[PDB]
């Protein structure tokens, strides 16, 4: 299971530049606003899902993007979707509760996790995610995110969640 230092070593090897802000885990709306004020670009949510057929899925989206989980399976070609179990979140993404992040894909050595990217987040620059724990927020450019995914061999499925279409 990878550390933050391991993640940044991976970024460095592959030319993904980063800027990190350390902070207590956010439980207050004022603190969240302060972070967003210091860190431009897309601020994310990252949903760890398991479908009725056993396939794991990670959706990274802007926080405000509405995701209709009742109907999404028709769009992405999955079985009906539920939230995945915490144990698999640890095993495949190496993160603990409340710390889900696209950067956790560095831990998915069996390539069990299919990755869905909100079109609105693909069209954000920069983008911000936790560096494997929610006591920090890490910015990378949009190109950097794509460089990261490419280095892992992860092809994102880009979904327009408003139109409910793969794009
Ligand atoms: Cl870049």
UniProtKB/TrEMBL annotation:
Protein name: DNA-binding protein, putative
Keywords of this entry: DNA-binding
Domain YbaK/aminoacyl-tRNA synthetase-associated: 23-148
Pfam families noted in UniProt: tRNA_edit
Similarity section: Belongs to the PRORSD1 family.
Highest taxon, organism lineage: Bacteria
InterPro entries hit by this protein: ProX/PRXD1 (IPR040285), YbaK/aa-tRNA-synt-asso_dom_sf (IPR036754), YbaK/aa-tRNA-synth-assoc-dom (IPR007214)
Leader sequence residues: none
GO molecular function: aminoacyl-tRNA deacylase activity; DNA binding
